[model samples]
Target: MRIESPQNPRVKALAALKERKERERTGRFLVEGRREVERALEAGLSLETLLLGPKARPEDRALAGGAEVLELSERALARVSTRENPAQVLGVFRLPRRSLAGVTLGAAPLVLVLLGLEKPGNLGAILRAADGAGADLVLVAEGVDLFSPQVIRNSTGAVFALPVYPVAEGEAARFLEEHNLPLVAATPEGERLYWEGDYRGGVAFLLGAEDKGLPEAWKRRAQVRVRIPMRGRADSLNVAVTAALLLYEALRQRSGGAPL
Candidate 1:
């Protein structure tokens, strides 16, 4: 079917996925670009429709497998697309409902715990880093929407590979404590360096927001509080950078110091 009007009910609803409330209300999120849609399908995410652009390719509709195909005029697609240039294809998928409740992990599973993170790009970068470092899971507390289109773009499809779960900060704290998992967090005034310590067993790294950073209450709650050892005038690094440093160090420890 073809949709020529931007005000079409489906078109408007799809555009509304940009808002957190709309996405939550509909239990859906937008996935643009051919590659991202491909990854979403590979992950078995249910798609209500695959909207094609003016430059749509044959494989674009085929990529959806059995999902409905909705063709749009160039201008109409632009109305709903997050990208300025727009992609040849976009998918509306049901937001994945994964949780930490019954997940299985390999020995010495590495986990990332994010606290009150609101930036989509930073969240995407962390997911990318988690995929790169082979972290087993990600637990978020009061974070921005994990299904944010900006996050999907910034992660470059790594979000599909990484299993991220959202929970309240107090619930996250209790969940980790319930599993007997040790928390290793980084701070500007930390006493220990990141690499010196061991992360052999199932461990989690607690990271904070971009500006305020982690609360002292959280730091006091951690089993190991460490620093990244900055030599420059800046007191802190990006949360994504900090997460990458800590996660890679854990990888190094688990792999007998093998280069990743």
Candidate 2:
């Protein structure tokens, strides 16, 4: 049955998932559309509930069957959805928490740490890069929610394949210390070029927001500072672009390539 009531309790609940505080408190987030839902399932995430709008696709229906399904009005779907034109199906899923201890140094364990990132799109893009480079983990520190709607959507579901964790500012340094991981911070004034770093063992790459580079505290904790050499008139690369370059560099160096 197509539900046409905007005042429905389920709709209100789904809308609340947009807020970071609500998502954190509830330990659940909404994944819109069949692609994201499929990605979530493929990544082994547990679905809490599924909500379907008037024109839900057949794939969505098949995936959502046997789960608790709620029908929502178009108005209600609009309120909860982030897209301009919302998809027909939305899923509420439990956030997956991964342990830093589980991170083992692969033949080349390249870890990307996002420090003080404020934009969801940037965070998502970084995760996508991490996934592409086969990174061992993606760590988000200080700012941004790991399971934000925009982050999830911008990532196009790459967040599932990458194990992401939100760590306190100082906590990341401590983890690197305890685990004996080499910490490298990305900066415009970096002494070593990004390609120079040895990413063969357990490595952590620290990337900051666009406006501010990295906290002075991180500088103190970081073993080395690295930069992506820019040739154009532009002063620096976008945070995500810089990250992608650095991540691939790690992948290459670990594969025994000379610094570019």
TM-score of each: 0.93, 0.88
10-114: candidate 2 lDDT, tens digit per residue: 677778888888888899999987788889988888888888887887667677646788777789789878889998878899987676677665544677888
Off by over 4 Å in 2: none
Instruction: Count clashes in each candidate, considering only residues at least 3 apart in sequence or on different chains.
Output: 0, 0
> Candidate 1 regions off by >4 Å?
258-260
- Across 1-260, the per-residue lDDT of candidate 1 in tens digits comes to 68899999878888999898998999988999888888788878898888899889887778766778899998789999989799988999998767777777665679998887556579889989999999888988754577888888998877886778888878888887877788888887788888776887788888988888998888998888989988989989999999999998998878787322
TM match of model 1 to true structure: 0.93
Least well predicted 10-residue stretch by lDDT in candidate 1: 251-260
